[PDB]
Design a protein around this ligand. Sequence first.
Ligand SMILES: Oc1ccc(C(=Nc2ccccc2Cl)c2ccc(O)cc2)cc1
Ligand SMILES: Oc1ccc(C(=Nc2ccccc2Cl)c2ccc(O)cc2)cc1
Lengths: 9, 9, 229, 236
Amino acid sequence: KILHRLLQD
Amino acid sequence: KILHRLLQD
Amino acid sequence: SLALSLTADQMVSALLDAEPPILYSEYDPTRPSEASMMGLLTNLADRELVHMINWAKRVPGFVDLTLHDQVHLLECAWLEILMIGLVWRSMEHPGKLLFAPNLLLDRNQGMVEIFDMLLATSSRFRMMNLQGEEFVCLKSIILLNSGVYTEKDHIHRVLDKITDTLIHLMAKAGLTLQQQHQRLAQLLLILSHIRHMSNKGMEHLYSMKCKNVVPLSDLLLEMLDAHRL
Amino acid sequence: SLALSLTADQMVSALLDAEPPILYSEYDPPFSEASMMGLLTNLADRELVHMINWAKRVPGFVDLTLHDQVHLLECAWLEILMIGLVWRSMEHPGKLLFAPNLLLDRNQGKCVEGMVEIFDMLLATSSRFRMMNLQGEEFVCLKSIILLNSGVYTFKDHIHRVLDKITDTLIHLMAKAGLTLQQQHQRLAQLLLILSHIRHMSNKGMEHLYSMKCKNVVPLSDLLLEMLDAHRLHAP
Ligand SMILES: Oc1ccc(C(=Nc2ccccc2Cl)c2ccc(O)cc2)cc1
Ligand SMILES: Oc1ccc(C(=Nc2ccccc2Cl)c2ccc(O)cc2)cc1
């Protein structure tokens, strides 16, 4: 999920 | 309209 | 208006007095479906609707509104009110939904989603130890609030009275001012989820309708059509 | 968790400071269904990137598992966009300020099926905010409540403790403006009940965005599509 990336970043 | 009636009585 | 005059302890009386009865299902345990189940719930909700409409008239301030606005409020809030009634019934049945005294179901017997949400709400009520008095307040708040944005001033005054009443109650149960604020906010935040469940529920029913397998009663069809046009 | 040790003055400041910027739409000026939905979809998509950054800065949000953070944003993102919209639209009675160069009214979203219903709801919410004289301080508290609350019952103690803290804070702001005790819990309740309407608007909006996805005439972004798919929808 793109959401995961954006949150870890 | 049924609700209309019922409310009226 | 007759509603702007009540003591808090009076408001509670009237709301308690006005409670609808708990209706039964036609559930025969000797028969074991999603179509049969929905047939029963539909029948049940259809009969409950009649008691709810006559309950609404007994909510302080409700009768004061124009007939067109009364109609709008119930069209808007009817499944929310059926649903909060359900989760209150079900509070002391962990893991089950008491649709009727003879119809107590678990998540095992889209549709599962709504069940799980109803179960989690019931659960939340339980950990909050919600009181019958807090409950009747909430149910009245939903009737008045859910359709108010879709005369309006008189409505806001009754809402404010019901707020006054919720706080009056919590002060009675020994809660500090900080604790009253938090519990109040906590109760009203659940109404957000009750709105959510009602929305999902209405969409489920709309697609049941089209499939034309579980017939909807004439009132349920009219109330459901209200939410699409 | 750091969130619970904040005073309420310290809470207001972290929230006021976490605020996402106000994004613009494409420049160059009448609208058609698809040019309008393009503009909004593009804007929403860019706004989502900032929302995630804002969410990571709502006290107690980073203390959550990655998964639970994901759950909350997925459930709440349109509510959060919408309450931002009605907050921006407050000073423009009659219009929706999607972006400073994108200020729309009722007649405009009428050239999309089912849009004027949602336009009218959003505008009504904006009126009520304006009539309540909603304050920026109160606003950011409300938006944080939406983030933490909307998805919590589809999972919690921590979250509910953070929700409590924000209630304290909201009340704190009300005691400052000189509100009596009765005035305080009446305005607290008034604010929170509008969250039920914001939820209703989101679900209406979500179904509409799903119509669009089935039409394939306005392309949704990969991210927006993932946010949308997390509601499964269709007729749920
Ligand atoms: O035709 C209908 C009408 C209402 C219901 C209903 N609950 C649901 C509604 C939609 C989806 C799921 C449920 Cl459980 C319900 C019925 C009675 C209650 O007291 C509470 C809920 C189900 C079918
Ligand atoms: O693809 C999208 C995504 C979001 C929006 C959006 N608002 C709506 C959403 C659905 C229906 C109607 C509107 Cl106005 C909206 C977008 C940005 C905002 O700041 C506020 C709302 C519209 C199209």
